[PDB]
Symmetry: D2
Subunit: 364 residues, 4 copies
């Protein structure tokens, strides 16, 4: 497990736009066969009926399928596509492409460098979403992803992205027909439960939360249970979980590094600055050493931000996750200088309640 990882942030003019990726291939900057994961921000609403996620995946897969002479469906088994919809405010649609080659000879750089591993779980039954099975399956996949990445210990783990399912009326009917109640009957709320259970799965695998406390009825209730590494994103485009583990390894030769932190709340730009700094970035002129930032954001569930009431959880026109992404996208943009960053909404059991984990990838 001695890799060389490459990471490319590429703009999208629309969800189906693969032109930035065609360009990387057509100019020899990346080899199609080495691509192992894509994390995207697509300009749908990021909630239930957002098919921009599936559309982006489908086109990327078709694009890679051509070059590899594979069926799209086969590419989707080989490459972890995680498309997070919702690019509110200044958030600029884009893909972060991850490529992996065997370690660039030896050549062991002075320290640990960026590594990455991927894993998948089985498809979940509707009645399993938001519940124990989703937690335990996720924990398992995290561990395999860690192994696949060549991450020696928890200490070298810096970011765990999970894509997870959500409930539809048909799925709810299917659960009911087996005499099982789904965790909720509201499709929007199902996303939070799916994210939450998945996040707790990560917390289990990282030993951040003792197994004993992970009972179903603690999902979305116990705000104290969380992983400071978990980034979960739900979607209608899949029935299983997709896991990407990102970290640091002595066996990696990547010209890249990753660090992580936590935002104490939606507007905690300070933490972001602090963690960026902890990677030797010391102006606005050095910012271009950052490849991208990946962050979780949420509407504070107590209904307050720094003592003041917010309306993000009372707004029936605009869902809380949409507000939250707009806010945190702005906070981060003010730091790095623009809104082409990965911000995902709904940070249930991810970092502190009202806040969320984030990571930064930069040139070594």
């Amino acid at each position: 497990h001695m890799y060389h990882i490459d990471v490319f942030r590429i703009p999208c003019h629309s969800p189906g736009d693969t032109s930035g990726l065609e360009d990387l291939i057509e100019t020899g900057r990346v080899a199609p066969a080495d691509i192992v994961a894509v994390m995207g921000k697509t300009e749908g609403n990021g909630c239930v009926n957002d098919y921009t996620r599936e559309y982006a995946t489908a086109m990327l897969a078709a694009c890679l399928g051509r070059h590899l002479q594979l069926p799209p469906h086969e590419v989707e088994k080989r490459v972890a596509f995680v498309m997070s919809g919702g690019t509110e405010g200044v958030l600029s649609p884009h893909h972060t492409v991850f490529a992996r080659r065997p370690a660039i000879d030896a050549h062991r750089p002075a320290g640990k460098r960026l590594t990455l591993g991927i894993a998948f779980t089985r498809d979940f039954l509707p009645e399993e979403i938001g519940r124990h099975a989703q937690i335990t399956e996720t924990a398992g996949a995290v561990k395999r992803a860690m192994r696949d990445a060549g991450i020696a210990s928890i200490d070298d783990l810096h970011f765990v992205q999970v894509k997870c399912p959500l409930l539809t009326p048909a799925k709810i009917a299917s659960a009911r027909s087996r005499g099982c109640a789904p965790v909720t009957t509201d499709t929007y709320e199902s996303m939070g439960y799916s994210r939450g259970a998945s996040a707790l799965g990560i917390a289990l695998a990282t030993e951040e939360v003792p197994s004993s406390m992970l009972v179903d009825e603690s999902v979305l209730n116990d705000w104290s249970l969380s992983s400071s590494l978990a980034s979960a994103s739900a979607g209608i485009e899949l029935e299983h979980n997709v896991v990407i583990a990102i970290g640091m390894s002595e066996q990696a030769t990547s010209e890249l590094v990753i660090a992580h932190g936590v935002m104490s709340d939606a507007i905690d730009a300070a933490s972001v600055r602090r963690t960026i700094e902890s990677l030797g970035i010391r102006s606005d002129d050095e910012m271009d050493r950052i490849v991208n930032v990946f962050a979780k954001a949420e509407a504070s569930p107590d209904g307050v931000v720094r003592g003041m009431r917010h309306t993000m959880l009372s707004d029936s026109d605009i869902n809380s996750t949409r507000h939250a992404r707009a806010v945190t996208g702005a906070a981060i943009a003010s730091v790095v200088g623009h809104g082409m960053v990965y911000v995902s909404g709904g940070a249930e059991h991810q970092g502190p309640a009202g806040g969320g984990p984030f990571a930064v990838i930069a040139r070594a």
Copy 2:
């Protein structure tokens, strides 16, 4: 309990518009002191952050407060204000004003005529919404409203409107601080639970559902439990339930009658025409004998309407109740010739699953 009931449908140009009501008062058509209930449709979103309901109530109360030389808050104890927001599609904002005077002696004439009674419950704690207390309190208020109306039996009862509360983040935090879990943590979903528990309260009082089956865990789960008379509407503007019972009494001398039915689903215009026709109305020029129509509508929770999938429960931009009101408002409008009708959304335990009760008020 010998009354003369008058009913007036009055247009609103905006939620605060009381001009249609000032006109009725000025022209001697209604006496301020006789008004006992107003059922309104206001052009807010009909969900959680719809303050058009409270605004309409506040202005109507202030308008009546002037004439009666009362404080608005006192008027709100004397008059049942039930404001249902959400006037999507062709739905036209309006108030239906109900006035009650001592029964006329110079006429009746013969048989049962429109009567109406009102009742209130106590304020509920956040943790009681959607649960047994809300059910039992509602059942009680239904009975009192019946008595106040002078409704001899269940058979003479044609419509039970209930206004009920909903959960906000502050209320949720309050319940949590007492160690009690609210029925849900999603404010939108809370509306359904509040409507549902209230509907089951009506079903209890009407003996339409045996007391034994009304357990908390059945609320929003058991679609077979329902009242074919219940119309529930949730709102952020109150902590208690307001109940208006409408029916027919031999003691009433109103020049008006009420009939009721159920829509088997959101587009079941047929039932509406069938119930209208059961009042000897059968051509679009007799239609002006109808004072108003009052109807419940909902997105079919199996996710299908007559075998075809719908997207009302998967749409995170537009909530299912908004779709449902648009649809049923249209269906009814196509029958009566316009959209100035009372359609409320979310018909949990109200009529059949996917359908909802409705009633028609017409000249004798």
Copy 3:
């Protein structure tokens, strides 16, 4: 121009779902090479940022591309894809597939039968949208489509569907950089202008409106100018217009017929019944002779429907076209028995102001 036309309404479980089409191919019911047009209803918002339209097109093209061993891009030149987003209320996502073979020998049936022709215009510059160039180019394409269909005269023309572009900030900037002002700077409003100009293009070609009156500044102003045959739908997925002309020809041997009418307003179910009847459909049991219904709907621009105010044009949360589709989708559903029908919103210069043209396709 002696054709046999086949028409298939196929359900979609999601925008990318081509399974209903794979099934028709895999069971010999349709030959991929004969398909000339697909008119779809996809479950995006039907406004500017609805990429469900492009996604559906992309997958259909990829699906057909496999069987024909063509690139998707090439299929999109051969087949007219018109995807109309927005499936509000009871509207059920689906595709209507059109296939064309040379006339099934001779075999001239007793009367005229369904025929269909397609045409395309060039790409428009941003500054041309909503304006004369779009009108005249559309008029031209209508005529070619008529010819391609083998439609002898205007009298045999029953439906003209046009897909047209819309404006984005980038397109607006591009127009500005050439010193030209775009017709509007609001992307949502641009859709109406694009639909409107296109509709007037149809009216020009059909001689329903004299050429003299079609000045730019009459677009969206003069409600009296209209085609009673035009159905226009705007989209972000194309820079040109796509035109499908549908009608009747003595040279066609299709086991299908088409008739058209106009809804005087959004809830004018009567007209639909009337036009259905004019094709010998005489119960609810004969309804299954209808293959599909295609209808335009809009928020009445005077702000009133049958004397009552509506809020469809004052609602900043939900755009007027979304309300309108919900309403008319419901009206039509109440007639044909379900919501799997083609309803498109924004009927500017299409039928009467507040109303819209529709057509019905049925078995001979």
Copy 4:
């Protein structure tokens, strides 16, 4: 013109909440008769159908009407109510109350201190909104407000808030019935035209734009024309313009000062910190010397923010002004430590295109 100005930021739990104001009155902190203006942020959508603005005004007026024994309508002539809806993201609903008393003699102390003057224009006809009449009337009212404030020169003027009307379908129909075309037929867009014309009115009065260039055809077209002091907010609750001029006067004895700047774009937190720092505030514990911040925000009309595409102008679910307020509310919150600040959206001819003016009020 010798005043003592007091400014109070008071939280609101809902649009109708006047409890924070009752508390100031009860505790002798402010005298009802001295209140001359209230600038509020209410939790409606901030667009066309936001009646939270009117509801807040109505209740504040009724609250003050009680204490002054006046009719609400009379209070509204005496006090400038400017309610800006839309509290997206971390924006916390609140009122800023302005009170004005005869200048204190027992102090001043030295130099210029906060002063404030108000003015009103006549009601505009629908066809005048967005056009020359609105520009010239606004310019006039700015001058009078200046005089009323006792502002010696343009240099001492720091902030000009204007509340302005918008178009409804009824108003549009009215303009049409007089043969006059409204500036737009889209109600949402009308808000921009009203804000823009009003902003140019301010620019005229401040000599920031030469009268010669202010032609109707330049409104929303010429982004180079702007006032760096103008803050305009449109609303359905009024037909005239309300102008509040805020600045510094030697005749004022207020313990408060005002400074202003411009945000170059929506995420330009830097400028805000820079202007804050120009008042000797440089650590998050000195921050409580700020009474409030007042800022304009807008979606950059070129469709890009710092070279990256944004989706704020292409999102048909969420209007650009809602995004913009969320973004800038967040940016500012990250600086002052919370979201209880006045941020208004739509900054047409206000500061730079894509940016907007802001001001800060602080203890001397």
